[PDB]
Design a protein around this nucleic acid. Structure first.
Length: 58
DNA sequence: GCGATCGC
DNA sequence: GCGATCGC
């Protein structure tokens, strides 16, 4: 689980600051990849994945 | 296509 | 079992 909030655009189309429920690195062998957060849209109650900043702690 | 994750 | 998440 994550700690600090993340500047996120929701599926519903709104800018929100949300603390991700799970975070992990998504990277192939030999390449940097990205960090991924699993988020819950507070309005709709639905889950979605979003890129995390590069320095976000896993 | 690779990489991990999980709600659906 | 997969969509969808990014950047290479």
């Amino acid at each position: 689980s994550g700690k600090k909030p993340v500047k996120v655009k929701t599926p519903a189309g709104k800018e929100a600051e949300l603390v991700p429920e799970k975070v992990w690195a998504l990277a192939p062998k030999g390449r940097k990849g990205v960090k991924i957060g699993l988020f819950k849209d507070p309005e709709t109650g639905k889950y979605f994945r979003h890129k995390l900043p590069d320095d976000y702690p896993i």
